[PDB]
Amino acid sequence: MFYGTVSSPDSGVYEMKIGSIIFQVASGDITKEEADVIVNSTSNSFNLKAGVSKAILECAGQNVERECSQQAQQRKNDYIITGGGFLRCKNIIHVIGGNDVKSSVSSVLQECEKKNYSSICLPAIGTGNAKQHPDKVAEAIIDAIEDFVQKGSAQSVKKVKVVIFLPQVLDVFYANMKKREG
Ligand SMILES: O=C(NCCc1ccncc1)NC1CCCCC1
Ligand SMILES: [Cl-]
Ligand SMILES: [Cl-]
């Protein structure tokens, strides 16, 4: 009851409506994206520096690294919200790559509504160091957005973009979108 048609605005880039949200996928470097929130896929200690998290932490800067460790030594966090540092965003949300991906995405969406944010950019959460399977990750990300729309929760959020390091993972996301199209 929610999905539009899959189309391609540029070479290797794909989009479809899910209710009121435009869902987009593309392969590339997530550290040169602009969005209200950029998501980092990290460890349960919020200090992973390998793969996409290496790139995010080095570009964001030592003040963001400091924010992560400061917050990690206060309570048991499922995820952590920091400033964007020298990334082009208002906040970074650091999620645990090994956690349930649907749950992690649902939390990001809810935190973005709380701040009246309109745009989100995320990696293929959990497919790096955590070694979750790409089609299970794609299914979980898109399911989280469907549930958020079904509940009438999308108000400020208008665009959700997955920027994916490996082209082979981009191909898996495309196939999952085609399976759902209306
Ligand atoms: O894939 C890589 N490095 C490739 C370079 C790269 C990766 C991501 N973002 C920018 C540059 N390392 C992997 C990460 C997962 C754990 C085992 C090492
Ligand atoms: Cl990725
Ligand atoms: Cl990961």
UniProtKB/Swiss-Prot annotation:
Tissues and organs where the protein is expressed, per its UniProt entry: Expressed in macrophages.
Lineage: superkingdom: Eukaryota
Residue sites binding a glycoprotein 3 per the record: 29-30, 41, 52, 126-130, 165
Post-translational modification: Auto-ADP-ribosylated.
Induction per the UniProt record: Up-regulated by IFNG in macrophages. Down-regulated by IL4 in macrophages.
Limits of the Macro domain: 10-181
Places the protein is found: Nucleus; Cytoplasm
Cystines in this chain: none
Subunit composition and interactions: Interacts with STAT6. Interacts with PARP10. Interacts with PARP9 in IFNG-stimulated macrophages; the interaction prevents PARP14-mediated STAT1 and STAT6 ADP-riboslylation.
Family named by the database record: Belongs to the ARTD/PARP family.
Function according to Swiss-Prot or TrEMBL: ADP-ribosyltransferase that mediates mono-ADP-ribosylation of glutamate residues on target proteins. In contrast to PARP1 and PARP2, it is not able to mediate poly-ADP-ribosylation. Has been shown to catalyze the mono-ADP-ribosylation of STAT1 at 'Glu-657' and 'Glu-705', thus decreasing STAT1 phosphorylation which negatively regulates pro-inflammatory cytokine production in macrophages in response to IFNG stimulation.
Name of the protein in its database record: Protein mono-ADP-ribosyltransferase PARP14
Organism: Homo sapiens
Taxonomy of the source species: Eukaryota, Metazoa, Chordata, Craniata, Vertebrata
Residues included from the entire protein: 1208 to 1388 of 1801
